[PDB]
Amino acid sequence: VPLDGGRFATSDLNDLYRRVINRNNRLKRLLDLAAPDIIVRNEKRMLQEA
Amino acid sequence: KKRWYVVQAFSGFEGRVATSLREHIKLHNMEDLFGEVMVGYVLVQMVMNDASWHLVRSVPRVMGFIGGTSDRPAPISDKEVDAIMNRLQQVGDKPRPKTLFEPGEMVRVNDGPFADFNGVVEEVDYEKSRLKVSVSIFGRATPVELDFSQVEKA
Amino acid sequence: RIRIRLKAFDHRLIDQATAEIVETAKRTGAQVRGPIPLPTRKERFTVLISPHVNKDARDQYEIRTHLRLVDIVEPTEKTVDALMRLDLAAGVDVQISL
DNA sequence: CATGGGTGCGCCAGACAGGG
DNA sequence: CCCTGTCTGGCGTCCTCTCACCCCATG
């Protein structure tokens, strides 16, 4: 829902879900591109922490 | 012999990280310890001394290397090496299509109001680089001309 | 350069079809050269009607044919957008050559 | 325009080492 | 293995009434 002004005051769960989906899309694209080992380890580790 | 390594930067300031890295090299004049810098990850041709490691992590807006450990970080294990050289040539001489079209062959439209629609190419024109395909719009087939890139092969 | 050919038989049903597609294009694209017709097309066939004799009973029927071409002037990304899966004329063959 | 990353609390309690 | 020290977690009163302010930043 927005506030008086009009800027949408967004919830925290939307930040969390949007982070997980951004990272998951990045990880699918790197497994498409066949990135090396350390890149996809950091990518999966960032998804795990997300 | 200089081997490759992977550097993590603040994603978005990556060109400025690359420029500041080249400038820190030419400041602290370890010119014989750095080969290139390739562009959120920055590829660095390098050798491993602890002095050069402190140099790259003292470059601003750089988090650190990405490897097995932080004592002896890991040379980027790029499976594609000579294949990555051919992949750079693939991106360079971009493999493009002129008029991918065939009679009675179904195609796919993903551009213009006809996007998200399929149809068949009754006629093809490689010289004019145009495919004659009609779309089943409101039942009646709508023969329209679409480019090879404007439509996908089905 | 963009052609909208319309192919049917009668001029008494295509006459509302040339009205619906110039005006709905006017509200969205407003870019059209106007309907330019084509010569009326005739398919006459004399056929024998007596069941086993008499080569004199030849009755003339015809499947009549008409063609009208709209020819919008500019490739508009609003005329085609609103009039893609849309055609008032029923039992008609539309040819939106883009 | 859209995305991308301090240093003043105190007790209980059980799990994890650490001697013992 | 039997006791001893450490290391992290889990927790701390209820209703109300205003106020002020909520992501830069930028090629």
Curated annotation (Swiss-Prot), chain A:
<comment type="function">
    <text>DNA-dependent RNA polymerase (RNAP) catalyzes the transcription of DNA into RNA using the four ribonucleoside triphosphates as substrates.</text>
</comment>
<protein>
    <recommendedName>
        <fullName>DNA-directed RNA polymerase subunit beta'</fullName>
    </recommendedName>
</protein>
<comment type="function">
    <text>Resistance to the antibiotics salinamide A, salinamide B, rifampicin, streptolydigin, CBR703, myxopyronin, and lipiarmycin can result from mutations in this protein.</text>
</comment>
<comment type="similarity">
    <text>Belongs to the RNA polymerase beta' chain family.</text>
</comment>
<comment type="subunit">
    <text>The RNAP catalytic core consists of 2 alpha, 1 beta, 1 beta' and 1 omega subunit. When a sigma factor is associated with the core the holoenzyme is formed, which can initiate transcription. The rRNA transcription and antitermination complex (rrnTAC) consists of RNAP, NusA, NusB, NusE (rpsJ), NusG, SubB, ribosomal protein S4, DNA and precursor rRNA; S4 is more flexible than other subunits.</text>
</comment>
Curated annotation (Swiss-Prot), chain B:
<dbReference type="InterPro" id="IPR005824">
    <property type="entry name" value="KOW"/>
</dbReference>
<dbReference type="GO" id="GO:0032784">
    <property type="term" value="P:regulation of DNA-templated transcription elongation"/>
</dbReference>
<keyword id="KW-0889">Transcription antitermination</keyword>
<comment type="subunit">
    <text>Monomer. Interacts with the transcription termination factor Rho and with RNAP. One NusG monomer forms a stable complex with a Rho hexamer. Binds directly, but weakly, to the core enzyme of RNAP. Also interacts with RpsJ (NusE). The rRNA transcription and antitermination complex (rrnTAC) consists of RNAP, NusA, NusB, NusE (rpsJ), NusG, SubB, ribosomal protein S4, DNA and precursor rRNA; S4 is more flexible than other subunits.</text>
</comment>
<dbReference type="InterPro" id="IPR008991">
    <property type="entry name" value="Translation_prot_SH3-like_sf"/>
</dbReference>
<dbReference type="Pfam" id="PF00467">
    <property type="entry name" value="KOW"/>
</dbReference>
<dbReference type="InterPro" id="IPR047050">
    <property type="entry name" value="NGN"/>
</dbReference>
<keyword id="KW-0805">Transcription regulation</keyword>
<dbReference type="InterPro" id="IPR001062">
    <property type="entry name" value="Transcrpt_antiterm_NusG"/>
</dbReference>
<comment type="function">
    <text>Part of the processive rRNA transcription and antitermination complex (rrnTAC). The complex forms an RNA-chaperone ring around the RNA exit tunnel of RNA polymerase (RNAP). It supports rapid transcription and antitermination of rRNA operons, cotranscriptional rRNA folding, and annealing of distal rRNA regions to allow correct ribosome biogenesis. Participates in transcription elongation, termination and antitermination. In the absence of Rho, increases the rate of transcription elongation by the RNAP, probably by partially suppressing pausing.</text>
</comment>
<feature type="domain" description="KOW">
    <location>
        <begin position="103"/>
        <end position="134"/>
    </location>
</feature>
<dbReference type="InterPro" id="IPR014722">
    <property type="entry name" value="Rib_uL2_dom2"/>
</dbReference>
<dbReference type="GO" id="GO:0006353">
    <property type="term" value="P:DNA-templated transcription termination"/>
</dbReference>
<dbReference type="InterPro" id="IPR036735">
    <property type="entry name" value="NGN_dom_sf"/>
</dbReference>
<dbReference type="GO" id="GO:0005829">
    <property type="term" value="C:cytosol"/>
</dbReference>
UniProtKB/Swiss-Prot annotation, chain C:
<dbReference type="GO" id="GO:0008023">
    <property type="term" value="C:transcription elongation factor complex"/>
</dbReference>
<dbReference type="InterPro" id="IPR001848">
    <property type="entry name" value="Ribosomal_uS10"/>
</dbReference>
<dbReference type="InterPro" id="IPR036838">
    <property type="entry name" value="Ribosomal_uS10_dom_sf"/>
</dbReference>
<dbReference type="InterPro" id="IPR027486">
    <property type="entry name" value="Ribosomal_uS10_dom"/>
</dbReference>
<dbReference type="InterPro" id="IPR018268">
    <property type="entry name" value="Ribosomal_uS10_CS"/>
</dbReference>
<keyword id="KW-0690">Ribosome biogenesis</keyword>
<dbReference type="GO" id="GO:0031564">
    <property type="term" value="P:transcription antitermination"/>
</dbReference>
<keyword id="KW-0689">Ribosomal protein</keyword>
<dbReference type="GO" id="GO:0005829">
    <property type="term" value="C:cytosol"/>
</dbReference>
<keyword id="KW-0804">Transcription</keyword>
<dbReference type="GO" id="GO:0042254">
    <property type="term" value="P:ribosome biogenesis"/>
</dbReference>
<dbReference type="GO" id="GO:0003735">
    <property type="term" value="F:structural constituent of ribosome"/>
</dbReference>
<dbReference type="GO" id="GO:0022627">
    <property type="term" value="C:cytosolic small ribosomal subunit"/>
</dbReference>
<protein>
    <recommendedName>
        <fullName>Small ribosomal subunit protein uS10</fullName>
    </recommendedName>
</protein>
<dbReference type="GO" id="GO:0000049">
    <property type="term" value="F:tRNA binding"/>
</dbReference>
